[PDB]
Design a protein around this nucleic acid. Structure first.
Length: 50
DNA sequence: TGCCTGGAGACTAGGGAGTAATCCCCTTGGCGGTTAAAACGC
């Protein structure tokens, strides 16, 4: 998913908006993977207290 | 104590109830996640 999104965004210069649905207990793994492999793409993740 | 009418016995049948066949929808049990509600204390 990261490779496809990054390739499309680098080719088209259309970084977003993009929406991803991630089930719980995996949000932090996706966050760490995005921070590590693709620092150029930022993400907004909702969690914690209302 | 005497009298009689409501109760009972025999015969007929048809319709409501019992039984089989069919199926899907409402229920039951469980788990995830969130958070407003429940518990404890001064």
């Amino acid at each position: 998913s990261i490779s496809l999104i990054t390739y499309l965004y680098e080719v088209k210069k259309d970084i977003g908006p993009f929406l991803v649905i991630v089930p719980l207990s995996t949000i932090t793994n996706w966050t760490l993977e995005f921070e590590k492999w693709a620092p150029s793409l930022n993400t907004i993740i909702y969690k914690g207290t209302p």
